[PDB]
Structure formats: structure tokens, C-alpha cells
Amino acid sequence: APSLSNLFYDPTYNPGQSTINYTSIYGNGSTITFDELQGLVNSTVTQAIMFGVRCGAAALTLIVMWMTSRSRKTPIFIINQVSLFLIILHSALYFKYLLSNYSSVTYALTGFPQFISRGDVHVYGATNIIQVLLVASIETSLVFQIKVIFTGDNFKRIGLMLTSISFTLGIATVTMYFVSAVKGMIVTYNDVSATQDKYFNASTILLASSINFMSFVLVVKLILAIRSRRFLGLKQFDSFHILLIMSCQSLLVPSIIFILAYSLKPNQGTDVLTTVATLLAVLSLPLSSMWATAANNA
């Protein structure tokens, strides 16, 4: 503490317009303000916050789903476990990414490819493969939720149609995620300072449209299946009510979160809200099973 400068006593000076001087590949001065830097750090912290929420919610849902799911060896239980373990493992690799040398402001300000370690490239690839397997597990669950729920309906013509369309969408999104993954891998392995996000947007919209399709089918069907129970009988509080509530939640909240992720300001780190939408689309079914068992037991 040699001596406090005059600007410590001025009540009008703001640090946000002050300039940082640092070295970069493009030039020598490359001035940047503390508010672009705090935007970068706030985006990184916001991504970390949502991925922490994902990791904690998925881990505790996995733990609770074991403690209480009496119907072990069901395919939907095994799929739900594979999906929760893949959410946890994806969140873990991402938690390394946020604390690595690609999310650091060292690389986001100074585009130096020497700072890059090839292990970080391998972590990037492992995360992309785990995301592909996650989408595969989610669509396996959904094709297994429409196949099983369409068994027993007299109108099996339209049930088979619905299974077919859903399964087509599942294969299309899984193939698009794998194509996006490999088209990002060849570019990253070749040049560490480039990206291929062209197919990303398409694969995420494909997944969102699949989820939207599922919530439509499950809500339409359950609506006709409580209208048939209201013209004869009544539908106000049975487990029927729990499935209908979770399917209306799956209808309204992940779509709202997808549009919120596509509408808000860019570069603020809010773009990973699509992962909260997929988190809730995953967590609708195990929580639905828990409520269903805890309203059937009585």
C-alpha cells in the first residue's frame, strides 16, 4: 500500500469503463473493459450454476428412485437409470470443462492454441459422445413410453402410427446429434480454434420437437381418457390426476424454457437453459412413477 490514488476518493469514477491492457495474438494493446470481462465470467458462472442444478437434481432423483421403485427389472426403470447416470456424467465432464483451459478467460481473451492441452480435446470428445448417448437413452425411454402406453388401446391403428412417427423423430435426433458430434470432432482435432455449431441448432430443435410431440400425445390421450371417465364416472383426484398433471407440466415448462433460451440476450450464458428443459423432460417420468406408486399404495 504505497499510496491510495486520487480516484479512490472520487465518488463518480466507475471501474466499468476502465480498460485492461494485455497481450494477444492479434495485436499488442488489445484493450478490453472490465464489463466485457465480467460478462464472460458471469456467463461461465451461470453455466456452472445450471449444471450444478442438473447434477444435484439428477443424482438425488437417481438415489430416491432406487430407494422407492419397487418395480425393478422394468425396461423403463433401467432406461431411467441409464439416463440419470448419463446426466450426472455429462454434468461432471462439463464441470471439468468450466474449470479447464477452454472456458478460461485466458483463452477467451488471448486466442493462443499453445495453451491448449490435448487432454482437454479428449474431454471435449468424451462429453460429446456422452451427450449422444444421453439423447439416445431419452429417446429410448420415449419410444418405450409410447410403445407401452399404446398397448391395450382398441384404436391400435393410430397407436402404431404414433409409435412410428415418434421412433422416426428419435432416430433423426440421435443421428443428427452424432453427425454434429463428428463434424465438431474433426474440426476441433484439426484446428483447436474453430467450431461447427451449424448442426447443433438443428439437433436441439429436433429434440425439443420430439419432447413437444410426446407431451401432445400423452395429454391428448389422457384427456380423452378422463373425458370418457367424466361422462361415466368422475375425474377430479385419482392417480389419473397425477399423470395428467405431470404430462401438462411436461407440455408447458420445457417448451417455455426452450423459447426462453432462444429469446433472451445472447452471450450471457443463458443459452444452456435447453439443458434445464431436457432435465425437466427427463425428471417428469421418475417423479410421475413416484407419485403414482405413492397414490396407488393407499
Partner: peptide
């Protein structure tokens, strides 16, 4: 409204 942007090596969301 905007397209999602991946930083030069951001793994998949």
C-alpha cells in the same frame, strides 16, 4: 431471438 452459439470448443449443452 438468436441461434445458440458454441464457443470455439464448448462441448454439447
Amino acid at each position: 431471438w438468436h441461434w445458440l452459439q458454441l464457443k470455439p470448443g464448448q462441448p454439447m449443452y
